[PDB]
Amino acid sequence: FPRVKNWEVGSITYDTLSAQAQQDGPCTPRRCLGSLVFPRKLAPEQLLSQARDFINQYYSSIKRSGSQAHEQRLQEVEAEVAATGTYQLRESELVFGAKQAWRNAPRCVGRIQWGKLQVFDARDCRSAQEMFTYICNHIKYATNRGNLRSAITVFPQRCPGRGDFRIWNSQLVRYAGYRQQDGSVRGDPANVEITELCIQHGWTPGNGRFDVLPLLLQAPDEPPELFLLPPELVLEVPLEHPTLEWFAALGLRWYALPAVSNMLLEIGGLEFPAAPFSGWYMSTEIGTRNLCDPHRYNILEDVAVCMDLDTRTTSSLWKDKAAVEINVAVLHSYQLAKVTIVDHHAATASFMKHLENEQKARGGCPADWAWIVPPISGSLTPVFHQEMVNYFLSPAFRYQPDPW
Amino acid sequence: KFPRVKNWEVGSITYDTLSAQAQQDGPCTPRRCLGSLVFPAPEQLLSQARDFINQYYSSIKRSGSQAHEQRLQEVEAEVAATGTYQLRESELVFGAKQAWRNAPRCVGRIQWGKLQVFDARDCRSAQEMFTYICNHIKYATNRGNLRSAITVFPQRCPGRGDFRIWNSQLVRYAGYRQQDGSVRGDPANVEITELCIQHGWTPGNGRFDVLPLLLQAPDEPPELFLLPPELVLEVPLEHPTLEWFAALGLRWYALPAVSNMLLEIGGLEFPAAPFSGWYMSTEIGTRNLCDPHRYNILEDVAVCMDLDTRTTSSLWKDKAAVEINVAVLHSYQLAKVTIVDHHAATASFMKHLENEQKARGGCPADWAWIVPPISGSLTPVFHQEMVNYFLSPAFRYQPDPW
Ligand code: HEM
Ligand code: HEM
Ligand SMILES: Cc1cc(N)nc2cc(-c3cncc(CN)c3)ccc12
Ligand SMILES: Cc1cc(N)nc2cc(-c3cncc(CN)c3)ccc12
Ligand SMILES: Cc1cc(N)nc2cc(-c3cncc(CN)c3)ccc12
Ligand SMILES: C[C@H](O)[C@H](O)[C@H]1CNc2nc(N)[nH]c(=O)c2N1
Ligand SMILES: [Cl-]
Ligand SMILES: [Cl-]
Ligand SMILES: [Gd]
Ligand SMILES: [Zn+2]
């Protein structure tokens, strides 16, 4: 039972929940691998025991264990797998398992919200044009004209036999990235690969820096085909600064809805290779990482030139000064546009309350310190001073090979 | 099977074969990572010794030579006869450099071979100790042009007690509790302040009162020693444009000299071996002044800046903090005292990582400690994956001797 301390206040708690971790992680007594983005590398017999454990926490959370109403559910599952080698989830179980995978996501800082999630059950899906209609229902419901609502849409699980449903884009909204005789990039360098797949699959390229990409959707066994998102379903936010009037002229935008569509939803031993979820942005994700990472839009020196900062010497902290204004512009622009967003202070403070909540509820919370701490002003937030334990619980969102 | 490590800013990939020989074990398991925690007889002393000697004779390009097998047999025979052994001076110098080189939370390690080693292993009393320490401080400070130094005091030995310095650093500011239950000065130092008082220190009542030294000679209670005002170079803090900032009366000192860590070399243990470098400006500006449980000036500066502190989305904290860091860097450069900002520091740590991979095939690095406390992803170490593990020689933490 690891001892975890908060250095700002002095409180101590013990993490008893860690003892129930099973899926072993990357670290050993010899060496710590906590900072690696993708840890390690990306006869059903074992399918039963995973299913059993999940059902036991489902009925643990709700009502009753012991001559209850779920040895019946225990029996139906093992009879289901005995018959067909896989089983189906009750809609409330899929709902509960969806909420738990969010609750167990060590790298997510917004888990104080894990109880409010809209689980669309898309398991009766049959083709790409139908998928695309689920994805569009989600996007409309999530966006909600800027009053954002957490939502996940679960497509049919992996079933031994033939291929699985697959969103080829990493998100539902991604900006194109084009190359030159420079080898430089116009638009988002994170999306240089998928941009040329859309092109090689028929899409006509675009103007440049903020072209929303088409959707590459894949039904089982079929080759993927492109889908164009309706420009009215893709709410974007022009970036302007409250007092730097020239900032709007830089032409920067970002989209409203963060919707990750490449991760794998594992519930009770079932694998859902297509289960896109969405929430709302923390502001530093846009202002600091997306716009200012050297391998992303890399705008930092451009904004410092415009602010007339001393870029000739690092010790003027021009990088720090321009990055703060970029973030102030993000927060300002989303609020003026009435689009849900949350700044890294509000968010980290909420996550501390989540930690105390989870301490009383489950005796701990898995948290990945390096991803909980924001990428600007780390030690200014309380999460910086909070020791944390990182470990894998199921249900879980997990990374997966991309379909190439 | 060696960990694969990527730099995401550039696309680089390397493999950390050096982690494979990590001689001590940490707190992480495959069940759970604890990287974020702050505080994670005969031939076992001989095995660390043989390894260290193997290290030394490898760096002087003389591995497996005449002089090498002799030293092994010397050290072995000495542990049989005395239970311990004595480092030669050249070994001590190399051992102290490796300890810095091996320190996984140090972003200043590009400098690790530029290290001035003072051998005080002949020290006899707390009074001699004091004299050696004033010499260390005088040499490291060097009128504001700081130099890396370490003074090594006698090793832990059977039959005698330890030398210990009770202060966590050579230069620290008093922390007095008070009427409000509040602390005046540095809250991180209330306990050592209470120990100095009850050992005969006449306490002041300011916010930046330099503490006396509590020095322990073996099997003796600690003795108080005052540092001469002129040995402790301080820096008044002002801001290059916010002229009201100098009216906060804030100061910091020049020399960061950590005195409470244990130096370990080939199984031998030195519980007293203070070491000093020069500050990175975030240690002072961000942590020491803005930590809510340290001086905690952030709101008072943000109010003085006429920022809107009612709402977090104005980012008033980030803005006040960045100007505090500016003021720290300005003030140190104005006073001609060495200082490094977190952009220069992290860029040189990247160069250190590239040197280390070519030399030893890797580098122990604690990401959460290497990444600065403000502007993290603005620096290149953010996008560098790292491998944390414990190599000897090393500095370790040790319990407080009270
Ligand atoms: C409600 C507002 C939410 C906020 C503000 C938020 C914020 C964040 C942030 C900042 C990260 C770090 C990602 C990175 O920078 O690499 C993250 C990760 C993550 N989020 Fe949340 N999130 C929210 C909702 C959700 C929802 C609804 C789900 C799923 C149902 C979810 C699941 C995850 C997962 C699995 C990760 C880890 C992703 C990975 O490991 O690659 N989050 N979140
Ligand atoms: C010359 C310039 C140096 C710089 C810029 C520097 C920078 C730093 C920084 C920023 C830290 C982390 C501080 C924190 O915990 O907040 C650190 C830690 C450390 N440094 Fe360096 N340092 C320098 C010199 C040295 C020297 C000369 C030694 C030893 C001979 C050393 C050994 C260590 C150790 C052992 C730690 C970890 C401290 C701990 O575990 O509590 N450093 N350094
Ligand atoms: C639901 C949700 C909300 C939010 N604000 N950010 C997310 C960020 C991710 C995410 C995961 N891996 C990598 C990235 C980009 N480095 C982002 C996934 C889901 C998110
Ligand atoms: C030689 C040296 C130089 C420097 N600039 N900072 C140091 C900082 C420390 C250090 C040790 N324990 C705790 C801290 C702050 N959490 C800092 C130790 C040595 C340092
Ligand atoms: C996770 C983490 C990362 C990091 N780089 N430094 C930490 C420093 C502390 C810390 C250490 N000693 C004293 C204090 C008082 N602020 C705080 C706690 C956690 C930290
Ligand atoms: C190398 C390092 O582990 C990597 O850049 C991580 C660190 N922390 C992060 N934290 C968040 N939220 N998002 C990220 O992409 C990263 N990147
Ligand atoms: Cl994003
Ligand atoms: Cl300090
Ligand atoms: Gd002024
Ligand atoms: Zn670990």
PDB file of C-alpha atoms in Angstrom, chain A residues 187-337:
ATOM      1  CA  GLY A 187      -1.103  23.257 -41.657  1.00  0.00           C
ATOM      2  CA  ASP A 188      -0.755  20.779 -38.832  1.00  0.00           C
ATOM      3  CA  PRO A 189       2.438  18.652 -38.945  1.00  0.00           C
ATOM      4  CA  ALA A 190       0.836  16.124 -36.583  1.00  0.00           C
ATOM      5  CA  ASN A 191      -1.482  15.242 -39.506  1.00  0.00           C
ATOM      6  CA  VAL A 192       0.929  15.057 -42.444  1.00  0.00           C
ATOM      7  CA  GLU A 193       0.473  11.290 -42.874  1.00  0.00           C
ATOM      8  CA  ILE A 194      -3.316  11.081 -42.740  1.00  0.00           C
ATOM      9  CA  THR A 195      -3.516  14.126 -45.035  1.00  0.00           C
ATOM     10  CA  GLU A 196      -1.865  12.230 -47.897  1.00  0.00           C
ATOM     11  CA  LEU A 197      -4.009   9.157 -47.233  1.00  0.00           C
ATOM     12  CA  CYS A 198      -7.137  11.292 -47.683  1.00  0.00           C
ATOM     13  CA  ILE A 199      -5.518  12.605 -50.868  1.00  0.00           C
ATOM     14  CA  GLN A 200      -4.545   9.163 -52.163  1.00  0.00           C
ATOM     15  CA  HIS A 201      -8.126   8.041 -51.436  1.00  0.00           C
ATOM     16  CA  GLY A 202      -9.567  10.764 -53.662  1.00  0.00           C
ATOM     17  CA  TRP A 203      -9.791  13.906 -51.534  1.00  0.00           C
ATOM     18  CA  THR A 204      -8.876  17.139 -53.257  1.00  0.00           C
ATOM     19  CA  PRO A 205      -6.205  19.065 -51.275  1.00  0.00           C
ATOM     20  CA  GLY A 206      -6.958  22.471 -49.822  1.00  0.00           C
ATOM     21  CA  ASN A 207      -5.898  26.079 -49.351  1.00  0.00           C
ATOM     22  CA  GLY A 208      -3.529  25.501 -46.432  1.00  0.00           C
ATOM     23  CA  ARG A 209      -3.161  25.989 -42.719  1.00  0.00           C
ATOM     24  CA  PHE A 210      -6.647  25.291 -41.273  1.00  0.00           C
ATOM     25  CA  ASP A 211      -8.405  22.890 -43.681  1.00  0.00           C
ATOM     26  CA  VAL A 212     -10.536  20.375 -41.795  1.00  0.00           C
ATOM     27  CA  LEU A 213      -9.660  16.925 -43.061  1.00  0.00           C
ATOM     28  CA  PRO A 214     -12.170  14.451 -44.488  1.00  0.00           C
ATOM     29  CA  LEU A 215     -13.058  11.358 -42.476  1.00  0.00           C
ATOM     30  CA  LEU A 216     -11.590   7.996 -43.461  1.00  0.00           C
ATOM     31  CA  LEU A 217     -14.092   5.430 -42.190  1.00  0.00           C
ATOM     32  CA  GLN A 218     -13.642   1.667 -42.443  1.00  0.00           C
ATOM     33  CA  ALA A 219     -16.305  -1.021 -42.207  1.00  0.00           C
ATOM     34  CA  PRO A 220     -15.177  -4.612 -41.532  1.00  0.00           C
ATOM     35  CA  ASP A 221     -13.091  -6.077 -44.371  1.00  0.00           C
ATOM     36  CA  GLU A 222     -14.000  -3.257 -46.714  1.00  0.00           C
ATOM     37  CA  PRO A 223     -11.427  -0.680 -47.805  1.00  0.00           C
ATOM     38  CA  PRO A 224     -11.989   2.717 -46.192  1.00  0.00           C
ATOM     39  CA  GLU A 225     -13.776   5.479 -48.031  1.00  0.00           C
ATOM     40  CA  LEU A 226     -13.734   9.213 -47.457  1.00  0.00           C
ATOM     41  CA  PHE A 227     -16.520  11.239 -45.859  1.00  0.00           C
ATOM     42  CA  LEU A 228     -16.764  15.038 -45.821  1.00  0.00           C
ATOM     43  CA  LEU A 229     -17.964  16.603 -42.586  1.00  0.00           C
ATOM     44  CA  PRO A 230     -20.716  19.219 -43.057  1.00  0.00           C
ATOM     45  CA  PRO A 231     -19.024  22.586 -42.429  1.00  0.00           C
ATOM     46  CA  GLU A 232     -21.968  23.518 -40.197  1.00  0.00           C
ATOM     47  CA  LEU A 233     -21.317  20.491 -37.971  1.00  0.00           C
ATOM     48  CA  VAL A 234     -17.683  21.604 -37.412  1.00  0.00           C
ATOM     49  CA  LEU A 235     -17.740  24.522 -34.973  1.00  0.00           C
ATOM     50  CA  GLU A 236     -14.481  26.467 -35.112  1.00  0.00           C
ATOM     51  CA  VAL A 237     -13.245  29.407 -33.040  1.00  0.00           C
ATOM     52  CA  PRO A 238     -11.272  32.308 -34.545  1.00  0.00           C
ATOM     53  CA  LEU A 239      -8.487  33.285 -32.184  1.00  0.00           C
ATOM     54  CA  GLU A 240      -8.322  36.911 -31.068  1.00  0.00           C
ATOM     55  CA  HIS A 241      -6.605  38.594 -28.171  1.00  0.00           C
ATOM     56  CA  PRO A 242      -8.394  40.881 -25.655  1.00  0.00           C
ATOM     57  CA  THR A 243      -5.826  43.690 -25.968  1.00  0.00           C
ATOM     58  CA  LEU A 244      -3.351  42.758 -28.757  1.00  0.00           C
ATOM     59  CA  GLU A 245      -5.459  43.902 -31.704  1.00  0.00           C
ATOM     60  CA  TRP A 246      -3.020  42.462 -34.270  1.00  0.00           C
ATOM     61  CA  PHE A 247      -3.422  38.903 -32.943  1.00  0.00           C
ATOM     62  CA  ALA A 248      -6.629  38.334 -34.931  1.00  0.00           C
ATOM     63  CA  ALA A 249      -4.714  39.219 -38.118  1.00  0.00           C
ATOM     64  CA  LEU A 250      -2.398  36.204 -37.627  1.00  0.00           C
ATOM     65  CA  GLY A 251      -5.411  34.192 -38.848  1.00  0.00           C
ATOM     66  CA  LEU A 252      -5.236  31.509 -36.173  1.00  0.00           C
ATOM     67  CA  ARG A 253      -8.180  29.230 -35.455  1.00  0.00           C
ATOM     68  CA  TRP A 254      -8.881  26.005 -33.584  1.00  0.00           C
ATOM     69  CA  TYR A 255     -11.900  23.735 -33.426  1.00  0.00           C
ATOM     70  CA  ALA A 256     -14.368  23.383 -30.568  1.00  0.00           C
ATOM     71  CA  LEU A 257     -14.599  19.642 -29.988  1.00  0.00           C
ATOM     72  CA  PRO A 258     -11.727  17.343 -28.956  1.00  0.00           C
ATOM     73  CA  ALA A 259     -12.868  13.949 -30.206  1.00  0.00           C
ATOM     74  CA  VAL A 260     -10.301  11.135 -30.114  1.00  0.00           C
ATOM     75  CA  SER A 261     -11.218   8.415 -32.601  1.00  0.00           C
ATOM     76  CA  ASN A 262      -8.270   6.032 -32.650  1.00  0.00           C
ATOM     77  CA  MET A 263      -8.207   4.480 -29.152  1.00  0.00           C
ATOM     78  CA  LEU A 264      -9.577   1.101 -28.111  1.00  0.00           C
ATOM     79  CA  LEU A 265     -12.312   0.602 -25.497  1.00  0.00           C
ATOM     80  CA  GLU A 266     -11.832  -2.608 -23.487  1.00  0.00           C
ATOM     81  CA  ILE A 267     -14.741  -3.660 -21.249  1.00  0.00           C
ATOM     82  CA  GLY A 268     -14.967  -7.051 -19.524  1.00  0.00           C
ATOM     83  CA  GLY A 269     -12.633  -8.664 -22.044  1.00  0.00           C
ATOM     84  CA  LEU A 270     -14.401  -7.166 -25.077  1.00  0.00           C
ATOM     85  CA  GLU A 271     -12.457  -4.920 -27.455  1.00  0.00           C
ATOM     86  CA  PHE A 272     -14.105  -1.994 -29.236  1.00  0.00           C
ATOM     87  CA  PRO A 273     -11.574  -0.737 -31.836  1.00  0.00           C
ATOM     88  CA  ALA A 274     -13.944   2.135 -32.726  1.00  0.00           C
ATOM     89  CA  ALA A 275     -15.456   3.988 -29.757  1.00  0.00           C
ATOM     90  CA  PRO A 276     -14.825   7.723 -30.259  1.00  0.00           C
ATOM     91  CA  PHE A 277     -15.122   9.908 -27.161  1.00  0.00           C
ATOM     92  CA  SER A 278     -15.191  13.661 -26.725  1.00  0.00           C
ATOM     93  CA  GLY A 279     -15.146  16.214 -23.948  1.00  0.00           C
ATOM     94  CA  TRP A 280     -14.118  19.838 -23.941  1.00  0.00           C
ATOM     95  CA  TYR A 281     -10.660  21.312 -24.216  1.00  0.00           C
ATOM     96  CA  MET A 282      -8.371  22.354 -21.466  1.00  0.00           C
ATOM     97  CA  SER A 283      -6.981  25.620 -22.802  1.00  0.00           C
ATOM     98  CA  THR A 284      -3.296  24.651 -22.600  1.00  0.00           C
ATOM     99  CA  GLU A 285      -3.903  21.778 -25.019  1.00  0.00           C
ATOM    100  CA  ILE A 286      -4.546  24.333 -27.744  1.00  0.00           C
ATOM    101  CA  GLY A 287      -2.495  27.360 -26.794  1.00  0.00           C
ATOM    102  CA  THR A 288       0.582  25.572 -25.529  1.00  0.00           C
ATOM    103  CA  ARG A 289       0.850  22.177 -27.194  1.00  0.00           C
ATOM    104  CA  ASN A 290      -1.000  22.495 -30.526  1.00  0.00           C
ATOM    105  CA  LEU A 291      -0.011  26.030 -31.401  1.00  0.00           C
ATOM    106  CA  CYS A 292       3.449  26.259 -29.756  1.00  0.00           C
ATOM    107  CA  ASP A 293       5.099  22.813 -29.876  1.00  0.00           C
ATOM    108  CA  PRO A 294       8.130  23.005 -32.213  1.00  0.00           C
ATOM    109  CA  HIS A 295       6.738  20.091 -34.266  1.00  0.00           C
ATOM    110  CA  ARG A 296       3.170  21.467 -34.379  1.00  0.00           C
ATOM    111  CA  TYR A 297       2.110  24.954 -35.534  1.00  0.00           C
ATOM    112  CA  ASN A 298       5.245  26.378 -33.888  1.00  0.00           C
ATOM    113  CA  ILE A 299       3.915  29.944 -33.710  1.00  0.00           C
ATOM    114  CA  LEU A 300       5.793  31.034 -30.602  1.00  0.00           C
ATOM    115  CA  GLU A 301       8.493  33.156 -32.228  1.00  0.00           C
ATOM    116  CA  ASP A 302       5.945  34.679 -34.609  1.00  0.00           C
ATOM    117  CA  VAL A 303       3.863  35.996 -31.734  1.00  0.00           C
ATOM    118  CA  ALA A 304       6.950  37.271 -29.911  1.00  0.00           C
ATOM    119  CA  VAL A 305       8.070  39.275 -32.967  1.00  0.00           C
ATOM    120  CA  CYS A 306       4.604  40.866 -33.111  1.00  0.00           C
ATOM    121  CA  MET A 307       4.753  41.630 -29.384  1.00  0.00           C
ATOM    122  CA  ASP A 308       8.163  43.278 -30.010  1.00  0.00           C
ATOM    123  CA  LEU A 309       9.909  41.002 -27.430  1.00  0.00           C
ATOM    124  CA  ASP A 310      13.667  40.542 -27.039  1.00  0.00           C
ATOM    125  CA  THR A 311      14.041  37.281 -28.921  1.00  0.00           C
ATOM    126  CA  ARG A 312      17.833  37.775 -29.047  1.00  0.00           C
ATOM    127  CA  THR A 313      18.342  36.269 -25.587  1.00  0.00           C
ATOM    128  CA  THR A 314      16.650  33.399 -23.749  1.00  0.00           C
ATOM    129  CA  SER A 315      16.928  35.134 -20.385  1.00  0.00           C
ATOM    130  CA  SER A 316      14.328  37.737 -21.372  1.00  0.00           C
ATOM    131  CA  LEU A 317      11.811  34.831 -21.097  1.00  0.00           C
ATOM    132  CA  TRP A 318      10.238  35.953 -24.375  1.00  0.00           C
ATOM    133  CA  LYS A 319       9.084  32.377 -25.006  1.00  0.00           C
ATOM    134  CA  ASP A 320       7.311  32.315 -21.648  1.00  0.00           C
ATOM    135  CA  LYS A 321       5.768  35.762 -22.179  1.00  0.00           C
ATOM    136  CA  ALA A 322       4.396  35.035 -25.676  1.00  0.00           C
ATOM    137  CA  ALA A 323       3.103  31.612 -24.673  1.00  0.00           C
ATOM    138  CA  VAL A 324       1.030  33.115 -21.868  1.00  0.00           C
ATOM    139  CA  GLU A 325      -0.611  35.613 -24.219  1.00  0.00           C
ATOM    140  CA  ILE A 326      -1.349  32.824 -26.712  1.00  0.00           C
ATOM    141  CA  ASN A 327      -3.170  31.030 -23.906  1.00  0.00           C
ATOM    142  CA  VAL A 328      -4.986  34.192 -22.815  1.00  0.00           C
ATOM    143  CA  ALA A 329      -6.172  34.483 -26.430  1.00  0.00           C
ATOM    144  CA  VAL A 330      -7.447  30.903 -26.472  1.00  0.00           C
ATOM    145  CA  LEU A 331      -9.459  31.349 -23.274  1.00  0.00           C
ATOM    146  CA  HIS A 332     -10.736  34.751 -24.442  1.00  0.00           C
ATOM    147  CA  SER A 333     -11.726  33.531 -27.914  1.00  0.00           C
ATOM    148  CA  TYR A 334     -13.571  30.438 -26.704  1.00  0.00           C
ATOM    149  CA  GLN A 335     -15.490  32.467 -24.122  1.00  0.00           C
ATOM    150  CA  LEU A 336     -16.450  35.202 -26.581  1.00  0.00           C
ATOM    151  CA  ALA A 337     -17.542  32.393 -28.919  1.00  0.00           C
TER     152      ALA A 337
END
